[PDB]
Amino acid sequence: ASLPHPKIVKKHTKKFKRHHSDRYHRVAENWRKQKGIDSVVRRRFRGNISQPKIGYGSNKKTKFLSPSGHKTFLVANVKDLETLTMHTKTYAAEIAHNISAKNRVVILARAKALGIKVTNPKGRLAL
Amino acid sequence: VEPVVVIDGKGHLVGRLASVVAKQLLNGQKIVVVRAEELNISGEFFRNKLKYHDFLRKATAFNKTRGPFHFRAPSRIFYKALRGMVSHKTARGKAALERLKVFEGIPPPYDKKKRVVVPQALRVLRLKPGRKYTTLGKLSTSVGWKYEDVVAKLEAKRKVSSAEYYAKKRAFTKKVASANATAAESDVAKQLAALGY
Amino acid sequence: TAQQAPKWYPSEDVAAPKKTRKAVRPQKLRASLVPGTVLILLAGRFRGKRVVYLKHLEDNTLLVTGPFKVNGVPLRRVNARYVIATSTKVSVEGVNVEKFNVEYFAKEKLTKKEKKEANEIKTERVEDQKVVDKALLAEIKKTPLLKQYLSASFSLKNGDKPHLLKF
Amino acid sequence: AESHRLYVKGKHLSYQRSKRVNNPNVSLIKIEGVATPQDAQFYLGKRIAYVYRASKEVRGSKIRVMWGKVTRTHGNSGVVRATFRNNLPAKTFGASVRIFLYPSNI
Amino acid sequence: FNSSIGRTAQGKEFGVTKARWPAKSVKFVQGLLQNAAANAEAKGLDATKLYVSHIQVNQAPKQRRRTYRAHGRINKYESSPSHIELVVTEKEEAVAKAAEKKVVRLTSRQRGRIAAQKRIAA
Amino acid sequence: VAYGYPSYSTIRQLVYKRGFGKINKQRVPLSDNAIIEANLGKYGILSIDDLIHEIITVGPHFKQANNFLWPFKLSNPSGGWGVPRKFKHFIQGGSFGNREEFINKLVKSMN
RNA sequence: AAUUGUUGAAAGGGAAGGGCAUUUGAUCA
RNA sequence: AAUACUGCCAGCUGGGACUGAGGACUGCGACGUAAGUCAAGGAUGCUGGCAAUGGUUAUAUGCCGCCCGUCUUGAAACA
RNA sequence: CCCUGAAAAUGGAUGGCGCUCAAGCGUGUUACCUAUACUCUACCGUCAGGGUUGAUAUGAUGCCCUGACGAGUAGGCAGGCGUGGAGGUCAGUGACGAAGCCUAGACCGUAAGGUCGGGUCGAACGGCCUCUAGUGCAGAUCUUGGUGGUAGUAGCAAAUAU
RNA sequence: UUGGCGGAAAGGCCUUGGGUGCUUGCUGGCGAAUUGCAAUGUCAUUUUGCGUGGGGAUAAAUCAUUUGUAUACGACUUAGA
């Protein structure tokens, strides 16, 4: 139930990790630009990691688009769900982690009634 | 084409043969080299003896057991020549090396198989007439090889056996040629000649 | 609200495609492909088996025959890129191929859910095949060794180079 | 018939590479019986198949094939350049692949 | 933990060359083994098929002490207490029910091929 | 640089293939005579053939005709430069220097 | 978290760690 | 006379690879006397298979890859 | 061209293997391989030249068209993520589970970061427009706490002896 | 199945007589399909365990004690139904 859109292509499907993250525990897996005078990553040698650049972006037509073709929208109540009544073709509901099951079931029922796709249907539900 | 290619070492230049065999092994063809003691190298015997002495001089100072292993057998010399050509450190180079089998003389599992020569690595086809060459067997036995007589006796016995086999094969071939000649001058023969085969 | 509001929503109205100036034209077959030509199939079940080209169907597949008293390939359609046309040719004059057409070979798309997890031919198709092959062998028998030639299957031997072989 | 072959033997030499930089997207295939580009300009556009075998059945068969096509000629020894849908695992530098005769123009 | 320890021939049966004969650890392990045997007997498990299926030794909080060194320096002289746990089980493993059916997906060409083999072979 | 006397055929090929104009300081491709007439009609040039004529035969408005055309961005020669070292004179065996009528082959190879 | 013990998985011819592409194993809509 | 060499064709044609962007019409052209058509300001038609492709991670393979930060013209340094 | 002149200390350098009508040397001619170089195309960002209140229809800081460019230390400017608090709003979430932690599970964004699935867990927490700062760590022989290789190792040998 | 040759890595080769098939050397008959325009369209070999029949025999090493041609411990060398 997605509008006709061009095939989503990603110029870099990998994750940009900080240098020496796998070497030192203090260095977390969050990108930080190397500002050292003799940093090989900063000097962009051959065989090292790749810094994020402006060219690694994505097409604006297929930006913020899930693989199912529906944009992700965070909802918290039935009133929030009513917002995407005439925009179910491009936006998909997503229940946040702070909603209990007693409201999750009602939200799912309303989404089914209004034909709104939910990205997390099996959330906090009995197995 | 052949799964295993047997190459004779007679009258073959060591460097050119080593390059050809290394290229074939990297391509992925199984190669066995026989009679490596008859390999010929350009230059004089004294020249190659001095070169081998210079190679022998190289050794690790602190522990000579960890230095370069100067193998003396002609087959091992050929193997070292090919190893200096193939990247033995990599797994692909290791596989190419295990694809190689170098022997002195004609082993029992290879005497009864066809032997192949390399036309682009032969002394009689590359070296200028009148140029001085040497024998790998003589160089090895002057450097320290100690099995020159054993391989010579084995080669003589194998040559006698192969001569008897070739006498029998020549008799059979003469009989087959006579049979083909008798079968010729027929309608099938004329049709085959018209169609080429 | 976890997310306040999207300021502008894209309109969920589909846009018609622009008019395309891409017409269709009949396929131009190779000069070596002419009805009555002996062909060798490269891909499929009946590969290597030798067949005879009869008619060019409108769906850009050649109508081919494997006359059933020779090698057993049925009257089928074959792609132009999976056939080699040999030099020898047997004419197909007097053999009617007007009945065969695209809707003759109806797929009748198989049912979806009920798959062949475990465990036929039409008498009309058998009749058309017999009618064709009768005249096919009637003409083929005029020249020697064609029957055995077509019964045999093509194969590549050692030392055979296709770029120097005149098929 | 003892022989049932409808393809041409080929050897996977290596990728289109340089002294220190290699490109896995394009490979080099050597064809037996071809020695010059003049006769190498016949197996162009043909489909090359790597037919390997695994120990786990995927869809009823343990034999899996990787498909590609011949793009152009590489060198004067008859070697050709090949582009595959999935690049070869680089462990097959010398493996035997099957170059089919389709699409056939002759 | 066999760095710079002596070698012996009593450990040849295990394939190692460096082995020792601990005393306090052996007594503690034997006591806990007898406790586990008593627990199993109280529960109702016969000792015929009882085997030690799990054991674990962790490091407990250290009992800090003091030592005296040269030039009036104070150093670190604590102990390394052990937290020991073990589980014995009755051994019983004859056979299982294997895996599920593992339904395979068959292409139309594959189905035709198997049909041909069935029709041709007896 | 390498420079030489061009011919009518190579001039026409260059203008047809890589012919680009300069309108409003922009590189607008020339695929119709209307743009050429609009941007050069004051000088009597109104078609691509007229522009080619002004290029081949130097006339009163050759300066404006050349200034209207964007410099041609050619590729590397298809058949190669033909010399082992480009940075040597043509008499010395390189692409550097005047090539006279030989520039036509190089230009068509690069175009 | 540093550190440590068991279970389950992988690798280990004088290091490990990373990037470019893929096979195989595990997992995933 | 023919041929070698160079240059031209707004002469024809065989084979192979990459790319499919734009989304009712607007303009410049051709065929067609005329309806209408077109390779003409960005690819459509038909058909086949499946309901495996692909994402994350480990190993393996071919190639590349010196230790982070500072001082310095010069750092990885035996600073 | 080659040879004597021409002798330095760990064992080694046209990179080596090796090469002799060379795979050495000078010159003449073709084919072949490649740079983040050149030409075209797809996408992102920046700049420039413009169109678009004749609307229900909102963001003219919005949308669209065309062209050109995209390196970089110190440094400047601009656009954004996140943290502790305050105002307005979501008559926001939550003991049927808020915060926190774990999670070679998944999604979005080039990136800082955000979100979902599961386990532990037990009372608070979040989005939007702004204001405020004791607001982001990888080092400073940085301050405090804890923990590893060394390492079950050195050692537990003066003072006659059990 | 009879015999012979081969020790370098022989582990293979030749040969004698019979049996079991095929024989496309030549001439006929029969069936080939509904696998759908190609989707490797298997039949080869490298180990481990399991199950079925025939066939071959019922052994050593280490620790423990001790010996000394031996030694830091290892290890070597011995012995004791």
From Swiss-Prot, chain B:
Gene Ontology biological-process annotations: cytoplasmic translation; maturation of LSU-rRNA; negative regulation of translation
Compartments, as annotated in UniProt: Cytoplasm
Post-translational modification: N-terminally acetylated by acetyltransferase NatA.
Placement of covalent cross-link Glycyl lysine isopeptide (Lys-Gly) (interchain with G-Cter in ubiquitin): 175
Keywords annotated in UniProt: Acetylation, Cytoplasm, Isopeptide bond, Ribonucleoprotein, Ribosomal protein, Ubl conjugation
Cysteine disulfide partners in this protein: none
A molecular-function term among this protein's GO annotations: mRNA binding
Transmembrane intervals: none
Statement: the UniProt record of this protein carries the keyword Glycoprotein: no
A GO term from the CC aspect: nucleolus
Binding partners and assembly: Component of the large ribosomal subunit (LSU). Mature yeast ribosomes consist of a small (40S) and a large (60S) subunit. The 40S small subunit contains 1 molecule of ribosomal RNA (18S rRNA) and 33 different proteins (encoded by 57 genes). The large 60S subunit contains 3 rRNA molecules (25S, 5.8S and 5S rRNA) and 46 different proteins (encoded by 81 genes).
Family assignment from sequence similarity: Belongs to the universal ribosomal protein uL13 family.
UniProt function note: Component of the ribosome, a large ribonucleoprotein complex responsible for the synthesis of proteins in the cell. The small ribosomal subunit (SSU) binds messenger RNAs (mRNAs) and translates the encoded message by selecting cognate aminoacyl-transfer RNA (tRNA) molecules. The large subunit (LSU) contains the ribosomal catalytic site termed the peptidyl transferase center (PTC), which catalyzes the formation of peptide bonds, thereby polymerizing the amino acids delivered by tRNAs into a polypeptide chain.
Protein name: Large ribosomal subunit protein uL13A
Swiss-Prot record, chain D:
Localisation: Cytoplasm
Keyword Acetylation set for record: yes
Keyword Disulfide bond tagged: no
Cross-link (Glycyl lysine isopeptide (Lys-Gly) (interchain with G-Cter in ubiquitin)): 46
HAMAP family documented for this protein: Ribosomal_eL33
Subunit structure, interactors included: Component of the large ribosomal subunit (LSU). Mature yeast ribosomes consist of a small (40S) and a large (60S) subunit. The 40S small subunit contains 1 molecule of ribosomal RNA (18S rRNA) and 33 different proteins (encoded by 57 genes). The large 60S subunit contains 3 rRNA molecules (25S, 5.8S and 5S rRNA) and 46 different proteins (encoded by 81 genes).
Name recorded for this polypeptide: Large ribosomal subunit protein eL33A
Organism: Saccharomyces cerevisiae (strain ATCC 204508 / S288c)
Lineage summary: Eukaryota, Fungi, Dikarya, Ascomycota, Saccharomycotina
Gene name linked to the record: RPL33A
Swiss-Prot record, chain E:
Originating species: Saccharomyces cerevisiae (strain ATCC 204508 / S288c)
Subcellular location: Cytoplasm
Gene responsible for this protein: RPL17A
Origin superkingdom: Eukaryota
Predominant localisation class: cytoplasm
Quaternary structure (record): Component of the large ribosomal subunit (LSU). Mature yeast ribosomes consist of a small (40S) and a large (60S) subunit. The 40S small subunit contains 1 molecule of ribosomal RNA (18S rRNA) and 33 different proteins (encoded by 57 genes). The large 60S subunit contains 3 rRNA molecules (25S, 5.8S and 5S rRNA) and 46 different proteins (encoded by 81 genes). uL22 is associated with the polypeptide exit tunnel.
BP GO annotations: cleavage in ITS2 between 5.8S rRNA and LSU-rRNA of tricistronic rRNA transcript (SSU-rRNA, 5.8S rRNA, LSU-rRNA); cytoplasmic translation
Homology family: Belongs to the universal ribosomal protein uL22 family.
Residues recorded as bearing Phosphothreonine in the entry: 8
Protein name: Large ribosomal subunit protein uL22A
Keyword Nucleus: no
Swiss-Prot record, chain F:
Alphabetical UniProt keywords: Cytoplasm, Ribonucleoprotein, Ribosomal protein
Main subcellular location: cytoplasm
Keyword Ribosomal protein: yes
One GO CC annotation: cytosol
Role played: Component of the ribosome, a large ribonucleoprotein complex responsible for the synthesis of proteins in the cell. The small ribosomal subunit (SSU) binds messenger RNAs (mRNAs) and translates the encoded message by selecting cognate aminoacyl-transfer RNA (tRNA) molecules. The large subunit (LSU) contains the ribosomal catalytic site termed the peptidyl transferase center (PTC), which catalyzes the formation of peptide bonds, thereby polymerizing the amino acids delivered by tRNAs into a polypeptide chain.
Miscellaneous information on this protein: Present with 101000 molecules/cell in log phase SD medium. There are 2 genes for uL30 in yeast.
Subunit structure: Component of the large ribosomal subunit (LSU). Mature yeast ribosomes consist of a small (40S) and a large (60S) subunit. The 40S small subunit contains 1 molecule of ribosomal RNA (18S rRNA) and 33 different proteins (encoded by 57 genes). The large 60S subunit contains 3 rRNA molecules (25S, 5.8S and 5S rRNA) and 46 different proteins (encoded by 81 genes).
Name of the featured protein: Large ribosomal subunit protein uL30A
Part of the whole protein covered: 134 to 244 of 244
